């Protein structure tokens, strides 16, 4: 059985530990602040707050495991924590990955319901968000539990201990099949669902006219309500046309800050960037690398497999970066921190 003599040193053995240190420092800080802010500076929690707290919980838990991984790279890739801790290290990475994707889908589906179908179902949205969150954690734990079988420690020829990121050669093909099932069900399907929600969010927002406020008095002109007292039909745009309150001209009017529109665009921008930079490259490369390891072990393919392996290492770092990028979403796409 021919095998491609893999030789990649001086790059990946510096990159991943540096990214892991960066993610630990920024991720522990941001998620500690977020978890502190939701628990002690938010009462009651809205629908999105429940999903955002769960996303922060998935990130902090994963961030908590990083020093072990950083140690492993600083210890010439020799795992000293045992078989069980290796399995738990790998399980948590995948639980964080898929839990994050599913909670991002929850936030996306929730904003679509708020933007398209807006009425005060405050407690109804909170109770449903808690129930959905529990189900999401149950789905993720169950679907990701095989990682506890596949992953584990292995003794190298030089007597060192590897903590397998995938699995042993005996279960590798089975692992690829399993990974394809989770890639399709917990990455591909949520991605199509997020895109649909975002397309419908952008469609609903672009089809509606913007409100204008007076800098002199503070009167808000609604395009749908209009101003029939002066001679403006309800439904007409601001450009189609004096202020009914104070009496100043149109020149003293500026566009109103819409909280739902701003939080929706921020979510659309941040999530799409995160899928384009982290989620999509990682899933493509994870798959490509397993495919090369299983089906492309011929001398003519070795050079290409090396490039795939190196590119995959890059995406592993990008995948981990989400843990320190996600807190930004709680302050730019989330509800204000208030205790009522
Ligand atoms: C309170 C938080 C927000 C501040 C973050 C503190 C950092 C300065 C700490 C936390 C994680 C630490 C790392 C955790 C793990 C390791 C692995 C450790 O590995 C070894 O000891 C193996 C050496 C060998 O056996 O050859 C070396 C220190 C290092 C890089 C640590 C250096 C200092 C770090 C980056
Ligand atoms: C039997 C086969 C066909 C199932 C395929 C597996 C997955 C494609 C399914 C199973 C569980 C599903 C998840 C179950 C629950 C949700 C919560 C849902 O969030 C809401 O309903 C938000 C409600 C709100 O707060 O307004 C968004 C989709 C999502 C992640 C689903 C996405 C698709 C998943 C991963
Ligand atoms: C308007 C549409 C076309 C933009 C779609 C946005 C994303 C879905 C794109 C932007 C960057 C793309 C990635 C750019 C680079 C690669 C590396 C590429 O790796 C290889 O070619 C392997 C061998 C090598 O490293 O040369 C595999 C596809 C992938 C992940 C691409 C998958 C699709 C991504 C994430
Ligand atoms: C977080 C637990 C559940 C222990 C864990 C599970 C699986 C794999 C690794 C793992 O964590 C560790 N295992 C062995 C050695 C180190 C760790 N992790 C660890 O030390 N995390 C840590 C987290 C926070 C922390 O406080 C600090 F941020 F530095 F202020 C100091 C250390
Ligand atoms: C009730 C809800 C949450 C559905 C959960 C279904 C779970 C139990 C399913 C979904 C995907 C499945 C895996 C898909 C592929 C493989 C590879 C095969 O070689 C061994 C079984 C294994 C590893 C499956 C075991 C069961 C599995 C983990
Ligand atoms: C709260 C604010 C959020 C802060 C967000 C943190 C900023 C992102 C950090 C680094 C970007 C990633 C750079 C990726 C560079 C990869 C290219 C590379 O050099 O990797 C090759 C390596 O040798 C392996 O083979
Ligand atoms: C909000 C506050 C801002 C926080 C921002 C701070 C983030 C630190 C950034 C880079 C540190 C990474 C250090 C680079 C360490 C490289 C690891 C290495 O040398 O590899 C180990 C090697 O394998 C052993 O032989
Ligand atoms: C109703 C709510 C139900 C919630 C469900 C809770 C499930 C917890 C999930 C993972 C923790 C288990 C971590 C398992 C760590 C692996 C250890 C192991 O199994 O040991 C391997 C081997 O035997 C040693 O050599
Ligand atoms: C709710 C309950 C949650 C489901 C619990 C464990 C899922 C099964 C994980 C075990 C994966 C075994 C992989 C396997 O069957 O592969 C062996 C095959 O012989 C290779 O060729
Ligand atoms: C209500 C639903 C609650 C269910 C929650 C799901 C949690 C599943 C727990 C373990 C997965 C089964 C995988 C078994 C992991 C043990 C490790 C193993 O399989 O051993 C491999 C090898 O022998 C050692 O090197
Ligand atoms: C929606 C967002 C758009 C999704 C973007 C890319 C999808 C993945 C397609 C990339 C598949 C890699 C191509 C491949 O399979 O070629 C590798 C093979 O080893 C050589 O023969
Ligand atoms: C139509 C709706 C599109 C939605 C799918 C979105 C992203 C697919 C990218 C993740 C899937 C993993 C890559 C696909 C793959 O299998 O190609 C690699 C190949 O196996 C190696 O030779
Ligand atoms: C609406 C806002 C959406 C914003 C849209 C943003 C588009 C993202 C573009 C590129 C990120 C993909 C990064 C892919 C990482 C591959 C790096 C690589 O090629 O690996 C190097 C390796 O060393 C060589 O062999
Ligand atoms: Zn006025």
XYZ file of C-alpha atoms and ligand atoms in Angstrom:
695
model
C 0.000 0.000 0.000
C 1.711 3.157 -1.364
C 1.473 6.319 0.801
C 2.375 9.954 -0.050
C 5.437 10.844 2.111
C 3.864 13.976 3.729
C 6.446 16.689 4.563
C 5.052 19.955 6.023
C 7.230 21.522 8.794
C 8.015 25.095 9.919
C 4.575 26.433 8.857
C 1.605 24.491 10.402
C 3.534 23.874 13.670
C 3.667 27.670 14.236
C 0.376 28.813 12.550
C -2.206 26.744 14.520
C -0.593 27.405 17.984
C -0.383 31.199 17.172
C -4.047 31.313 15.991
C -5.052 29.229 19.079
C -3.255 31.717 21.448
C -4.942 34.681 19.608
C -8.386 32.945 19.752
C -7.881 32.049 23.441
C -6.978 35.642 24.488
C -9.623 37.481 22.355
C -12.253 34.670 22.676
C -11.956 34.302 26.471
C -12.203 38.134 26.858
C -15.149 38.705 24.453
C -17.128 35.641 25.623
C -16.430 36.359 29.326
C -17.760 39.925 28.773
C -20.777 38.572 26.757
C -21.678 35.842 29.366
C -21.275 38.490 32.191
C -23.442 41.042 30.263
C -26.281 38.545 29.483
C -26.444 37.113 33.072
C -25.972 40.304 35.209
C -26.890 43.140 32.750
C -29.947 41.717 30.846
C -33.420 41.022 32.394
C -35.650 39.737 30.769
C -33.995 38.010 27.768
C -35.600 38.416 24.321
C -35.802 35.646 21.666
C -32.417 36.519 20.058
C -30.784 36.991 23.535
C -31.531 33.302 24.350
C -29.880 32.182 21.027
C -26.991 34.689 21.446
C -26.286 33.487 25.010
C -26.254 29.859 23.755
C -23.829 30.815 20.914
C -21.572 32.549 23.545
C -21.790 29.396 25.737
C -20.686 27.199 22.766
C -17.735 29.572 22.094
C -16.520 29.970 25.738
C -16.636 26.126 26.296
C -14.505 25.568 23.147
C -12.209 28.517 24.132
C -11.743 26.781 27.561
C -10.090 23.770 25.786
C -7.565 25.835 23.759
C -4.657 25.915 26.343
C -4.482 22.045 26.182
C -4.196 22.265 22.355
C -1.639 25.134 22.579
C 0.406 22.951 25.064
C 0.227 19.940 22.652
C 1.793 22.071 19.816
C 4.424 23.470 22.238
C 5.137 19.825 23.350
C 6.251 18.554 19.850
C 2.687 17.219 19.176
C 2.815 14.818 22.188
C -0.616 14.491 23.919
C -0.104 13.993 27.693
C -3.783 14.391 28.724
C -4.926 10.849 27.869
C -7.333 9.214 25.407
C -10.575 10.547 27.040
C -9.370 14.221 27.048
C -8.332 13.913 23.405
C -11.851 12.611 22.530
C -13.442 15.448 24.566
C -11.136 18.031 22.904
C -12.294 16.884 19.436
C -15.974 16.511 20.470
C -16.122 20.092 21.846
C -14.602 21.532 18.612
C -17.374 19.885 16.515
C -20.100 20.713 19.108
C -18.974 24.376 18.982
C -18.836 24.312 15.141
C -22.329 22.862 14.579
C -23.914 24.471 17.637
C -22.683 27.866 16.327
C -24.049 27.178 12.821
C -27.443 26.089 14.229
C -27.641 29.087 16.640
C -26.709 31.421 13.736
C -29.606 29.769 11.801
C -31.936 30.375 14.834
C -30.946 34.106 14.956
C -31.391 34.343 11.134
C -34.855 32.607 11.217
C -35.875 34.798 14.220
C -34.917 38.100 12.442
C -36.794 36.907 9.304
C -39.933 36.383 11.497
C -39.459 39.857 13.043
C -38.744 41.690 9.732
C -41.299 39.870 7.475
C -44.074 38.901 9.995
C -44.282 41.565 12.844
C -48.516 42.420 18.218
C -46.490 41.535 21.372
C -45.405 37.853 21.571
C -42.484 38.671 23.937
C -42.827 35.744 26.404
C -44.030 33.433 23.545
C -40.808 34.173 21.551
C -38.605 33.772 24.704
C -40.223 30.447 25.827
C -40.000 29.090 22.239
C -36.332 30.276 21.953
C -35.441 28.383 25.201
C -37.231 25.217 23.948
C -35.610 25.486 20.455
C -32.168 26.081 22.127
C -32.539 22.870 24.204
C -33.541 20.876 21.051
C -30.547 22.391 19.144
C -28.130 21.276 21.923
C -29.767 17.797 21.909
C -29.534 17.494 18.072
C -25.846 18.658 18.082
C -24.762 16.365 21.024
C -26.442 13.314 19.391
C -25.204 14.027 15.815
C -21.656 14.866 17.051
C -21.404 11.965 19.607
C -19.619 9.618 17.020
C -16.558 11.998 17.322
C -16.202 10.385 20.822
C -15.759 7.004 19.038
C -13.567 8.120 16.032
C -11.195 10.520 17.793
C -8.566 9.454 20.325
C -4.866 8.970 21.031
C -2.363 6.970 18.976
C 1.235 5.912 19.685
C 3.695 6.967 16.929
C 6.828 4.947 15.883
C 9.031 7.502 17.776
C 6.891 6.601 20.904
C 5.117 10.036 20.981
C 1.321 10.368 21.442
C -0.904 11.873 18.731
C -4.384 13.129 19.546
C -6.144 12.201 16.222
C -8.004 15.153 14.612
C -9.777 12.587 12.354
C -9.342 8.872 13.374
C -7.154 5.719 12.853
C -6.725 4.290 9.259
C -9.115 1.383 10.093
C -12.098 3.771 10.659
C -11.059 6.583 8.231
C -13.461 5.708 5.357
C -16.350 5.385 7.887
C -15.322 8.793 9.333
C -15.437 10.430 5.838
C -18.982 9.018 5.300
C -20.094 10.231 8.735
C -18.475 13.685 8.125
C -20.350 14.002 4.786
C -23.679 13.317 6.622
C -23.033 16.072 9.219
C -21.608 18.472 6.516
C -24.850 18.143 4.487
C -27.326 18.124 7.410
C -25.695 20.676 9.767
C -23.770 22.924 7.411
C -25.296 22.738 3.839
C -28.986 22.744 4.898
C -28.566 25.566 7.521
C -26.533 27.534 4.876
C -29.383 27.296 2.303
C -31.864 28.274 5.071
C -29.751 31.278 6.202
C -29.416 32.504 2.526
C -33.188 32.228 1.982
C -33.889 34.185 5.228
C -31.310 36.867 4.220
C -32.702 37.127 0.682
C -36.218 37.591 2.120
C -34.891 40.054 4.806
C -33.131 42.188 2.114
C -36.219 41.902 -0.241
C -38.624 43.131 2.533
C -36.287 46.025 3.522
C -35.437 47.293 -0.033
C -39.175 47.324 -1.010
C -40.049 49.774 1.845
C -39.430 53.583 1.961
C -37.421 55.282 4.778
C -38.831 57.646 7.480
C -37.573 61.262 7.876
C -37.087 63.288 11.110
C -36.950 67.081 11.709
C -33.679 68.507 13.149
C -35.538 71.658 14.395
C -38.508 70.021 16.250
C -38.314 66.197 16.148
C -41.353 65.251 13.992
C -41.046 61.828 12.297
C -42.640 61.675 8.806
C -43.868 58.131 8.013
C -44.020 57.387 4.214
C -47.006 54.989 4.676
C -48.993 57.368 6.982
C -48.107 60.543 5.021
C -49.451 64.053 5.766
C -53.032 64.619 4.403
C -53.484 67.949 6.311
C -51.015 69.815 4.004
C -51.557 67.847 0.755
C -49.572 64.552 0.873
C -51.408 61.260 0.070
C -50.671 58.242 2.387
C -48.161 55.825 0.822
C -46.130 58.402 -1.194
C -42.318 58.897 -0.891
C -40.635 61.922 0.826
C -39.178 63.098 -2.561
C -42.734 63.269 -4.104
C -43.568 66.450 -2.061
C -43.297 72.156 5.112
C -43.295 70.392 8.542
C -46.835 70.081 10.086
C -45.437 70.514 13.645
C -42.980 73.500 13.639
C -43.294 74.733 10.020
C -39.725 74.461 8.615
C -38.862 73.339 5.045
C -37.835 69.883 3.720
C -34.089 70.866 3.919
C -34.142 70.465 7.764
C -35.122 66.730 7.522
C -32.822 63.651 7.833
C -33.396 59.830 7.613
C -34.581 58.126 10.870
C -32.286 55.514 12.533
C -34.196 52.201 12.157
C -33.048 49.725 14.897
C -34.387 46.518 13.230
C -33.001 47.474 9.751
C -29.492 48.270 11.166
C -29.312 45.069 13.337
C -30.577 42.970 10.364
C -27.986 44.312 7.851
C -25.154 43.877 10.440
C -26.250 40.229 10.979
C -26.513 39.635 7.170
C -22.998 41.162 6.584
C -21.223 39.460 9.587
C -22.778 35.979 9.042
C -22.169 35.891 5.253
C -18.517 37.022 5.791
C -18.059 34.350 8.490
C -19.490 31.614 6.140
C -17.298 32.835 3.231
C -14.087 33.123 5.301
C -14.483 30.261 7.822
C -17.391 27.789 7.458
C -17.343 27.206 3.654
C -13.479 26.996 3.244
C -13.245 24.606 6.259
C -15.994 22.202 5.058
C -14.592 22.128 1.490
C -10.998 21.518 2.732
C -11.964 19.030 5.506
C -13.708 16.958 2.769
C -10.925 17.452 0.136
C -8.226 16.373 2.663
C -10.091 13.200 3.734
C -10.738 12.390 0.009
C -6.975 12.837 -0.807
C -5.984 10.658 2.214
C -8.409 7.862 1.189
C -8.616 7.849 -2.613
C -5.624 9.762 -4.009
C -2.600 7.817 -2.699
C -0.708 7.603 -6.050
C 2.747 9.243 -6.704
C 1.281 11.559 -9.422
C -1.224 12.966 -6.825
C 1.232 13.535 -3.892
C 2.164 17.172 -4.804
C -1.550 18.148 -5.123
C -2.447 16.305 -1.826
C 0.268 18.381 -0.061
C -1.300 21.662 -1.287
C -4.771 20.415 -0.185
C -3.308 19.472 3.263
C -1.572 22.905 3.663
C -4.762 24.781 2.571
C -6.828 22.633 4.994
C -4.433 23.646 7.892
C -5.184 27.339 7.014
C -8.977 26.723 7.196
C -8.587 24.937 10.583
C -7.229 28.259 11.986
C -10.015 30.256 10.232
C -12.641 27.825 11.696
C -11.330 28.502 15.251
C -11.372 32.328 14.701
C -15.248 32.345 14.813
C -15.062 32.030 18.653
C -13.548 35.531 18.923
C -15.558 37.094 15.994
C -19.064 36.059 17.302
C -19.103 38.483 20.363
C -19.264 41.469 17.877
C -22.752 40.132 16.839
C -24.147 40.624 20.387
C -23.300 44.370 20.368
C -24.055 45.215 16.667
C -26.909 42.767 15.765
C -28.286 42.113 19.279
C -30.762 43.863 21.596
C -29.512 46.591 24.024
C -28.337 45.469 27.512
C -31.082 46.616 29.939
C -32.634 45.346 33.218
C -36.418 46.073 33.319
C -6.892 36.325 31.240
C -6.643 36.030 29.759
C -7.655 36.804 28.915
C -5.234 36.481 29.386
C -4.543 35.405 28.551
C -3.240 34.987 29.238
C -2.230 34.450 28.203
C -0.998 35.349 28.318
C -1.901 32.936 28.464
C -3.207 32.059 28.482
C -2.955 30.840 27.600
C -1.463 30.736 27.772
C -0.739 29.594 27.018
C -1.327 28.215 27.397
C -0.507 27.147 26.998
C 0.852 27.231 26.651
C 1.451 25.998 26.315
C 2.729 25.719 27.133
O 3.379 24.505 26.609
C 4.413 23.920 27.311
O 4.730 24.186 28.474
C 5.130 22.799 26.548
C 6.654 23.024 26.565
C 7.408 21.704 26.326
O 7.088 20.717 27.032
O 8.309 21.718 25.456
C 3.657 26.933 26.988
C 2.926 28.232 27.428
C 1.604 28.475 26.650
C 1.955 28.937 25.203
C 0.795 29.626 27.400
C 1.450 31.083 27.301
C 0.569 32.214 27.942
C -0.928 32.164 27.474
C -1.059 32.595 25.970
C -35.005 13.614 8.570
C -34.058 14.565 7.836
C -34.773 15.079 6.574
C -33.664 15.712 8.790
C -32.485 16.529 8.241
C -31.536 16.982 9.367
C -31.329 18.519 9.421
C -31.331 19.125 8.005
C -32.330 19.254 10.382
C -32.629 18.427 11.684
C -32.754 19.424 12.841
C -32.898 20.743 12.089
C -32.838 22.081 12.915
C -33.923 22.120 14.031
C -34.197 23.416 14.508
C -33.822 24.633 13.910
C -34.236 25.799 14.612
C -34.827 26.887 13.686
O -35.011 28.103 14.444
C -36.288 28.608 14.504
O -37.316 27.981 14.219
C -36.356 30.073 14.973
C -37.715 30.404 15.606
C -37.746 31.861 16.088
O -37.128 32.131 17.142
O -38.406 32.670 15.403
C -33.892 27.160 12.504
C -33.558 25.826 11.761
C -33.005 24.698 12.707
C -31.533 25.018 13.089
C -33.073 23.307 11.928
C -32.179 23.233 10.623
C -32.230 21.841 9.932
C -31.887 20.662 10.918
C -30.380 20.707 11.346
C -19.942 35.036 -6.079
C -19.458 33.690 -5.545
C -18.663 32.986 -6.647
C -18.569 33.919 -4.308
C -18.687 32.740 -3.334
C -18.020 33.074 -1.981
C -17.372 31.836 -1.296
C -18.368 30.651 -1.309
C -15.949 31.510 -1.890
C -14.958 32.713 -1.669
C -13.558 32.115 -1.451
C -13.750 30.670 -1.911
C -12.606 29.655 -1.560
C -11.228 30.099 -2.112
C -10.263 29.080 -2.000
C -10.531 27.705 -1.856
C -9.386 26.879 -1.796
C -9.480 25.699 -2.768
O -8.385 24.800 -2.466
C -7.703 24.230 -3.501
O -7.690 24.650 -4.661
C -6.898 22.991 -3.084
C -5.458 22.979 -3.622
C -4.758 24.338 -3.481
O -4.586 24.793 -2.328
O -4.395 24.885 -4.546
C -10.808 24.952 -2.575
C -12.026 25.917 -2.641
C -11.873 27.155 -1.704
C -12.106 26.723 -0.217
C -12.961 28.221 -2.136
C -14.468 27.776 -1.864
C -15.519 28.919 -2.108
C -15.151 30.247 -1.368
C -15.232 30.056 0.193
C -11.925 22.888 29.571
C -11.809 21.363 29.755
C -13.245 20.830 29.955
C -11.064 21.089 31.071
C -11.141 20.727 28.630
C -11.845 19.750 27.897
C -11.290 19.072 26.809
C -9.983 19.354 26.420
C -9.255 20.329 27.100
C -9.795 20.981 28.223
O -9.072 21.940 28.905
C -7.765 21.721 29.294
N -7.219 20.487 29.424
C -5.868 20.315 29.804
C -5.092 21.442 30.083
C -5.663 22.715 29.967
C -7.009 22.870 29.578
N -7.672 24.057 29.466
C -7.411 25.151 30.241
O -6.417 25.204 30.972
N -8.250 26.214 30.069
C -8.166 27.401 30.729
C -9.269 28.268 30.635
C -9.289 29.500 31.306
C -8.186 29.897 32.076
O -8.201 31.097 32.745
C -7.618 32.238 32.051
F -8.316 32.533 30.918
F -6.257 31.999 31.712
F -7.694 33.298 32.849
C -7.086 29.034 32.202
C -7.073 27.810 31.521
C -33.072 12.100 16.621
C -32.204 13.078 15.814
C -31.402 13.995 16.748
C -31.390 12.375 14.655
C -30.005 11.808 15.051
C -29.581 10.623 14.162
C -28.111 10.183 14.480
C -28.198 9.101 15.597
C -27.347 9.719 13.171
C -27.170 10.875 12.121
C -25.912 10.602 11.287
C -25.544 9.159 11.655
C -24.145 8.587 11.238
C -23.905 8.686 9.702
C -22.777 7.831 9.199
C -22.161 6.860 9.922
C -21.045 6.088 9.244
C -21.210 4.552 9.405
O -20.030 3.889 8.976
C -21.389 4.167 10.906
C -22.594 4.924 11.528
C -22.533 6.500 11.394
C -21.431 7.105 12.357
C -23.991 7.078 11.708
C -24.590 6.740 13.125
C -25.916 7.480 13.498
C -25.910 9.019 13.204
C -24.931 9.749 14.199
C -13.208 41.018 18.590
C -12.397 41.353 17.335
C -12.219 40.103 16.476
C -10.741 39.936 16.107
C -10.611 38.899 14.985
C -9.204 38.292 14.978
C -8.446 38.780 13.737
C -8.112 37.611 12.799
C -6.678 37.108 13.077
C -5.838 36.518 11.917
C -6.456 36.440 10.509
C -6.133 35.079 9.883
C -4.936 35.195 8.938
C -4.812 33.901 8.139
C -3.436 33.824 7.476
C -3.259 32.428 6.885
C -2.115 32.416 5.865
C -0.859 31.781 6.477
O 0.172 32.442 6.600
O -1.001 30.484 6.893
C -0.060 29.575 6.306
C 0.581 28.740 7.419
O 1.993 28.658 7.222
C -0.062 27.341 7.523
O 0.364 26.474 6.464
C -8.161 42.561 23.128
C -6.698 42.339 23.520
C -5.878 42.020 22.267
C -5.296 40.609 22.391
C -4.392 40.304 21.194
C -3.236 39.409 21.649
C -3.178 38.154 20.779
C -1.730 37.665 20.671
C -1.356 37.529 19.183
C -0.239 36.542 18.773
C 0.464 35.728 19.866
C 0.969 34.419 19.259
C 2.436 34.217 19.631
C 3.121 33.366 18.564
C 3.487 32.010 19.164
C 3.865 31.051 18.040
C 3.816 29.614 18.567
C 5.107 28.841 18.231
O 6.209 29.395 18.233
O 4.921 27.524 17.917
C 5.313 26.631 18.976
C 6.366 25.654 18.453
O 5.722 24.549 17.816
C 7.220 25.148 19.618
O 8.348 24.436 19.099
C -31.295 14.987 29.118
C -29.916 15.630 28.935
C -28.908 14.567 28.490
C -27.553 15.223 28.204
C -26.581 14.170 27.656
C -25.199 14.369 28.288
C -24.116 13.803 27.366
C -22.783 14.507 27.640
C -21.991 14.622 26.326
C -20.454 14.444 26.354
C -19.747 14.163 27.689
C -19.094 12.778 27.636
C -17.582 12.902 27.417
C -17.020 11.522 27.073
C -15.486 11.521 27.133
C -14.946 10.246 26.472
C -14.465 9.259 27.549
C -14.644 7.791 27.115
O -15.734 7.378 26.711
O -13.560 6.986 27.354
C -12.930 6.470 26.170
C -12.056 5.247 26.490
O -12.835 4.244 27.157
C -10.852 5.649 27.359
O -9.703 4.873 26.997
C -29.148 9.039 21.149
C -27.992 8.063 20.925
C -26.799 8.798 20.312
C -26.053 7.867 19.350
C -24.790 7.372 20.056
C -23.580 6.913 19.226
C -23.647 6.939 17.690
C -22.759 5.820 17.111
C -21.265 6.181 17.182
C -20.414 4.934 16.941
C -19.697 5.020 15.591
C -19.192 3.624 15.200
C -18.588 3.657 13.789
C -18.749 2.319 13.043
O -19.791 1.660 13.122
O -17.715 2.022 12.196
C -17.175 0.699 12.345
C -17.001 0.033 10.973
O -16.685 -1.350 11.162
C -15.866 0.711 10.195
O -15.622 0.023 8.966
C -31.092 11.953 25.714
C -29.936 11.702 24.740
C -28.633 11.492 25.519
C -27.544 10.968 24.572
C -26.356 11.941 24.538
C -25.337 11.486 23.489
C -23.961 11.288 24.140
C -23.321 10.031 23.546
C -22.147 9.518 24.399
C -21.081 8.633 23.705
C -21.238 8.354 22.196
C -20.871 6.910 21.851
C -19.412 6.839 21.385
C -18.591 6.024 22.390
C -17.439 6.866 22.943
C -16.502 5.990 23.774
C -15.127 5.864 23.118
C -15.043 4.655 22.179
O -15.976 4.353 21.434
O -13.896 3.930 22.288
C -13.051 4.006 21.122
C -11.744 3.248 21.376
O -12.054 1.916 21.808
C -10.890 3.956 22.448
O -9.591 4.286 21.931
C -23.389 28.379 -1.790
C -21.954 28.882 -1.623
C -21.098 28.417 -2.800
C -20.316 27.160 -2.416
C -18.861 27.294 -2.880
C -18.076 26.011 -3.211
C -18.805 24.659 -3.124
C -17.788 23.525 -3.026
C -17.277 23.123 -4.410
C -15.776 22.841 -4.320
C -15.534 21.349 -4.516
C -14.051 21.100 -4.733
C -13.855 20.585 -6.157
C -13.442 19.110 -6.153
O -14.220 18.243 -5.756
O -12.239 18.853 -6.747
C -11.229 18.317 -5.875
C -10.650 17.022 -6.463
O -9.748 16.421 -5.530
C -9.903 17.295 -7.767
O -10.218 16.255 -8.699
C -27.150 23.851 -4.269
C -26.991 24.193 -2.782
C -25.505 24.336 -2.425
C -25.312 24.398 -0.898
C -23.976 23.744 -0.507
C -23.067 24.798 0.131
C -21.556 24.513 0.298
C -20.995 23.163 -0.165
C -19.560 22.994 0.368
C -19.477 21.934 1.486
C -19.556 20.508 0.911
C -18.184 19.811 0.918
C -17.460 19.933 -0.434
C -18.136 19.081 -1.516
C -17.256 17.896 -1.921
O -17.584 16.750 -1.601
O -16.210 18.204 -2.754
C -14.902 17.842 -2.269
C -14.473 16.502 -2.880
O -15.089 15.426 -2.163
C -12.956 16.366 -2.798
O -12.468 15.638 -3.924
C -21.631 39.987 2.172
C -20.217 39.909 2.751
C -19.539 38.600 2.329
C -18.023 38.826 2.243
C -17.406 37.900 1.188
C -15.991 37.508 1.633
C -15.370 36.524 0.630
C -14.283 35.688 1.324
C -13.088 35.511 0.371
C -11.905 34.590 0.770
C -11.920 33.843 2.113
C -11.580 32.367 1.868
C -10.284 31.970 2.577
C -9.788 30.640 1.997
C -8.469 30.237 2.668
C -7.552 29.527 1.662
C -6.074 29.800 2.002
C -5.133 28.888 1.187
O -5.225 28.840 -0.040
O -4.276 28.095 1.916
C -2.879 28.435 1.773
C -1.970 27.220 1.544
O -0.768 27.371 2.311
C -1.600 27.117 0.059
O -1.315 25.749 -0.273
Zn -40.564 70.226 12.711
